[PDB]
């Protein structure tokens, strides 16, 4: 398997991934963008607060005609939500990466989320019945998630130019 | 802009054969040289007829040649830039010196049996490079089924 962030070596990093996960891709993208670049313990605490509705995930791209809340002011937005299922899936993947880091021997308390990325998985094809004997798609849009944690960390001058510089150096 | 009521006209005659015959190409090269380097009008007419298509080169028969060999032409070299055919209505072939693009087998046999000579056009170029003492003959152009139907 190849991760999208190929620049990060696996010597001092810990990676986790999950595929074909039946959780909303848009909600998961917003949650991952909320915790992108953070320390690991801060991300875990924030995701538990999201589950407990104590902190909100700001809705930036996939936010059309959503609601407004006072908990978006920490992010400078008005539109923010609490994607509990996305938070649960991301907590599971973050704890798997923590276990990988502990097995590898790294320092858990100094790790940051260097890379985190949500991609669209193949869609689940249910159907729904509409009026006048019609059938419409009722699809699920699942996601692939991957994350990587890392340790926190005068040539070719002209002769006139040369002569000017020599004279200034002498005087 | 310039007002040009009249129009420059591109050439409406053949400048080269459409044929891919290599020996005809060699003949055309030879007569291009002759019509460029001599003053004889014979060579220019011969070059133009070497350019021509087959409906523009109707066959010439031996009876037509014998008709034109009368009245002081008995010693002139006959030049035809088409096929010379035999006419079996002509029972007696006179002695004649004929240079043609090609001959039929019976026409060549009857000319040689009457004691004349058959030449190709390059032999004609060797012996008469200015077309001196020649009789240039064409066949009937409008003697065609389509031309009747025109």
């Amino acid at each position: 398997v190849r991760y999208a962030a190929t620049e990060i070596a696996p010597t001092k990093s810990a990676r986790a991934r999950g595929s074909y996960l039946r959780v909303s891709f848009k909600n998961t993208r917003e949650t991952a963008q909320a915790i992108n670049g953070w320390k690991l313990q801060r991300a875990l605490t924030f995701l538990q607060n999201v589950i407990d509705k104590k902190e909100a995930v700001p809705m930036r791209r996939y936010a059309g005609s959503t609601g407004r809340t006072a908990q978006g002011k920490q992010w400078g937005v008005s539109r923010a939500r609490w994607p509990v299922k996305s938070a649960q899936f991301l907590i599971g993947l973050l704890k798997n990466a923590e276990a990988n880091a502990d097995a590898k021997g790294l320092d858990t308390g100094n790790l940051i989320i260097k890379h985190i990325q949500v991609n669209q998985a193949p869609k689940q094809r249910r159907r729904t019945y509409r009026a006048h004997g019609r059938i419409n798609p009722y699809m699920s849009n699942p996601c692939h998630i991957e994350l990587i944690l890392t340790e926190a960390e005068e040539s070719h001058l002209s002769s006139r130019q040369r002569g000017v510089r020599i004279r200034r150096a002498l005087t | 802009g310039i007002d040009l009521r009249w129009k420059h006209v591109r050439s409406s005659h053949r400048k080269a054969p459409k044929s891919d015959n290599v020996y005809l190409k060699l003949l055309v090269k030879l007569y291009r040289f002759l019509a460029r380097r001599t003053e004889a009008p014979f060579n220019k007419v011969v070059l133009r007829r070497l350019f021509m298509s087959r409906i523009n080169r109707p066959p010439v028969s031996l009876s037509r040649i014998a008709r034109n060999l009368k009245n002081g032409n008995e010693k002139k070299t006959v030049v035809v830039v088409a096929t010379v055919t035999d006419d079996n209505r002509l029972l007696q072939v006179p002695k004649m010196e004929v240079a043609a693009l090609r001959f039929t087998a019976k026409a060549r046999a009857r000319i040689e049996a009457a004691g004349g000579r058959t030449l190709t056009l390059d032999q004609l170029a060797l012996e008469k490079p200015t077309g001196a003492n020649t009789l240039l003959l064409r066949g009937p152009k409008n003697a065609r089924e389509a031309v009747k139907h025109f």
Binding site: - | V22, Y23, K25, L26, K29
Partner: protein, 139 residues
């Protein structure tokens, strides 16, 4: 007769097995072709009298057509190897190209081809190292 150099040139002027045609020019692989160019002047396999020069181990090897052996391919070529001073090779090649009327139009090309082969037989000089330039290549 039915066969001549002009006839063979008309037969093979548009295609033959020696032809190398590309966008930037038409070349010939003919052994009797000095300058390796497709034209009647240089079509040595077409012409009755013709010259060709190939490298040897040291020096040049010159072949010429023999006009009396055109129907005998194994004995149709007069072959001389010049492995001596370049000036002597040029003198003999120009002599067999011009002194007896055997393709005096080819003597410049023949001397040039011999000179090119002898120049290619010299040892090559080492090229200077490539200078790295810019920012991405330099660093």
């Amino acid at each position: 007769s039915n066969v001549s150099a002009d006839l063979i040139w008309e037969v093979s002027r548009n295609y033959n097995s020696f032809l190398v045609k590309q966008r930037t020019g038409t070349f010939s692989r003919d052994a009797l072709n000095l300058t390796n160019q497709h034209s009647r002047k240089h079509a040595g396999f077409v012409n009755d009298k013709a010259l060709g020069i190939v490298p040897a181990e040291k020096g040049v090897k010159v072949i010429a057509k023999k006009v009396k052996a055109a129907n005998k391919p194994a004995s149709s070529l007069y072959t001389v190897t010049y492995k001596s001073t370049a000036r002597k090779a040029y003198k003999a090649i120009a002599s067999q190209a011009a002194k007896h009327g055997y393709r005096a139009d080819l003597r410049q090309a023949a001397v040039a081809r011999a000179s090119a082969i002898l120049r290619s037989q010299r040892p090559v000089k080492p090229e200077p190292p490539k200078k790295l330039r810019g920012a991405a290549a330099r660093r």
